[PDB]
């Protein structure tokens, strides 16, 4: 894939650890989650696969917490 | 537009720090810094300030935060809130962490600040990174 | 405007690397990368390319540089110049170092590359930092 | 002074180690040297006094070299 592999691991970690738990998935909720993940990664790109996976989980969890998104 | 950058960086700092309340402060007039405004905030306002009267607060330059910032260091405290636009002591705030940001000509132009009402917060080393990344990007923006 | 950012970052990379010749390469069409253009350069052009014909060169994706970049790594070599717009081997070039840059949607969009005609250059660790800083900033810019 | 102290040490190092050696100082040569120093520092702000002094010398020297500026 033509994608930044560090962003991709970062994004996939956020998806599989957090976003997949969203109770009410929709177009709008996916657009807002990606906009946050992309802006955050573009602000400070991670450099290790291990750190990208770590930071994609943490960041998505914080987004879920601070945004009060229904999980389970 | 400058506050577009300010609000976008603040949203990231807020979420990554998991603060209860966050703000970007802007000094005026340029190079003189007699006044400080909140030009962007996230979370719940402290009870001692309102959505009105978030601008035009005087800057006390003898406060530790001002001098620590000009020494190129971040500032934290449990009870000194120099630029918060009120003289009321506001004990509901348990903790504050801030860093300076500098404009395109390297002049001290404001701060990025996070506050907690709860008494649990992540380490200062993580707060240092979150804040410095945003200051680096805010430091590259202009005023249309 | 994008090349305003490109040319400003390139000027910094050129001076800090002390390269003999430097360039920013841009892929087209977006997401497909069949062609690569030099949209900015510093220093003396190699003899095997001219100020005309700096655009529209085909991209060989089986070249090591392309695949190394998509593995998230910088690339260097003494003899493989994949995107240099000529098929001539150009032995006057002693060394090349490049890093990828990615557009606002994280798609491989081009490279930042430095070349030396002399055989002395600073370490790859210093070249890594110079290149990564510029890629980080170029990665935040758009196309008007 | 109201100035970024890391930039100031960085800039002063470049001035005292390199720019002061310029044979032909003028308005234009000072404007071009500052524009390079400021853009470079804004690109990657140094964080230690020691590194700022180091990097202001190196960067200004490279600027003098690559720009072929008459020294002595
Ligand atoms: Cl950066």
Automatic annotation (TrEMBL), chains A, D:
Protein name listed in UniProt: Antiholin
Function field: Involved in lysis inhibition. Senses superinfections and inhibits the holin, thereby delaying the host cell lysis timing. The genomic DNA from the superinfecting phage bound to the complex holin-antiholin probably serves as a signal for the lysis inhibition and blocks the holin multimerization.
Entry GO CC: host cell periplasmic space
Chief localisation class: host cell
Record text on subunit structure and interactions: Homotetramer; in free-form. Homomultimer. Heterotetramer composed of 2 holin and 2 antiholin. The holin-antiholin complex binds dsDNA. Interacts (via C-terminus) with holin (via C-terminus); this interaction blocks the holin homomultimerization and delays the host cell lysis.
One GO-annotated biological process of the protein: killing of cells of another organism
Location in the cell: Host periplasm
Swiss-Prot/TrEMBL keywords: Cytolysis, Disulfide bond, DNA-binding, Host cell lysis by virus, Host periplasm, Signal, Viral release from host cell
Disulfide bonds: 46-52
Record PTM: Disulfide bond is required for functionality.
GO terms, molecular function: DNA binding; molecular function inhibitor activity
Domain of life assignment: Viruses
Family of the protein in this entry: Belongs to the T4likevirus antiholin family.
Automatic annotation (TrEMBL), chains B, C:
Organism of this sequence: Escherichia phage vB_EcoM_NBG2
Localization in the cell: Host cell inner membrane
Disulfide bond positions: 99-131
Residues of the full protein shown: 77 to 218 of 218
Annotated protein name in UniProt: Holin
Main function: Accumulates harmlessly in the cytoplasmic membrane until it reaches a critical concentration that triggers the formation of micron-scale pores (holes) causing host cell membrane disruption and endolysin escape into the periplasmic space. Determines the precise timing of host cell lysis. Regulated by specific antiholins that somehow sense superinfections and then delay lysis. Participates with the endolysin and spanin proteins in the sequential events which lead to the programmed host cell lysis releasing the mature viral particles from the host cell.
Entry keyword set: Cytolysis, Disulfide bond, Host cell inner membrane, Host cell lysis by virus, Host cell membrane, Host membrane, Membrane, Signal-anchor, Transmembrane, Transmembrane helix, Viral release from host cell
Domain note: The C-terminus serves, in association with the antiholin, as a DNA sensor for lysis inhibition under superinfection conditions.
Assembly: Homomultimer. Heterotetramer composed of 2 holin and 2 antiholin. The holin-antiholin complex binds dsDNA. Interacts (via C-terminus) with antiholin (via C-terminus); this interaction blocks the holin homomultimerization and delays host cell lysis. Interacts (via N-terminus) with the lysis inhibition accessory protein rIII; this interaction stabilizes the holin-antiholin complex thereby resulting in a robust block of the hole formation.
Gene Ontology cellular component list: host cell plasma membrane; membrane
Membrane topology, from the record: Single-pass type II membrane protein
GO terms assigned for molecular function: pore-forming activity
Top-level taxonomic group: Viruses
Record family assignment: Belongs to the T4likevirus holin family.
UniProt PTM comment: Disulfide bond is required for functionality.
Segments in the Periplasmic topological domain: 1-142
Major subcellular site: host cell
Keyword Membrane: yes
BP GO annotations: viral release from host cell by cytolysis
